[PDB]
Design a protein around this ligand. Structure first.
Ligand SMILES: C=CCNC(=O)[C@@H](NC(=O)[C@@](O)(CCCN(Cc1ccc(-c2ccncc2)cc1)NC(=O)[C@@H](NC(=O)OC)C(C)(C)C)Cc1ccc(CC=C)cc1)C(C)C
Ligand SMILES: [Cl-]
Ligand SMILES: [Cl-]
Ligand SMILES: [Cl-]
Lengths: 99, 99
């Protein structure tokens, strides 16, 4: 699709058996989701943005589906104020900025 | 241009006659720049990021070039980890997301 930026670019994702809404975020290195359960190994991480840092759990090799596009990547889970899809997954569905 | 996301989408901007680097950030409502001088009066704003909230100075109707594309709009100034160009100016230069 072509997604306008007049509004926040929100999409549905499918992950860990769940449907969630998330923001397509070209400014984010990483994908970060609100507290949820995911299978397999994880390790702690600090990530930073405006306002400073939060501690998250890093899960690797997680299948995700975004607008019908399947991908796999790292997902961070923790007390983020909103769900964001970061560049690490945006690349995999072939998402570009255009003007 | 078409910009892929394998690296951070950093571009050159020009504001107050000076070149800076800034990040094209579809996850940001607003444009926020690191401490700098701008003309005129400002108003208070609080903005929220992943880490929590900061206070910034809001300047309106500021000319700014983004990748050579001319815009004029609201620029916030405050303690951000990077210069970020948000949707308020991305829309002025005709930016969309595509996949
Ligand atoms: C650890 C590696 C580097 N860090 C990052 O890549 C992180 N990226 C972000 O925080 C960023 O892309 C911003 C994410 C989008 N965020 C998403 C977001 C949106 C709303 C909130 C929110 C909601 C309700 N209440 C409080 C906050 C929080 C985060 N929106 C905002 O922060 C914006 N806020 C808003 O647009 O407010 C609507 C704004 C920039 C104007 C503060 C902007 C950004 C981009 C790069 C860097 C590091 C660069 C040296 C820092 C910040 C995470 C998300 C991957
Ligand atoms: Cl990844
Ligand atoms: Cl590509
Ligand atoms: Cl504006």
């Amino acid at each position: 699709p072509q997604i306008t930026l007049w509004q926040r670019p929100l999409v549905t994702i499918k992950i860990g058996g769940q449907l969630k809404e998330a923001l397509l975020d070209t400014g984010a290195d990483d994908t970060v989701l609100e507290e949820m359960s995911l299978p397999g190994r994880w390790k702690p991480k600090m990530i930073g943005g405006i306002g400073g840092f939060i501690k998250v759990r890093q899960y690797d090799q997680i299948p995700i589906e975004i607008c019908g596009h399947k991908a796999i990547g790292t997902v961070l889970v923790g007390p983020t104020p909103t769900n964001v899809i970061g560049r690490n997954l945006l690349t995999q569905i072939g998402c570009t900025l255009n003007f």
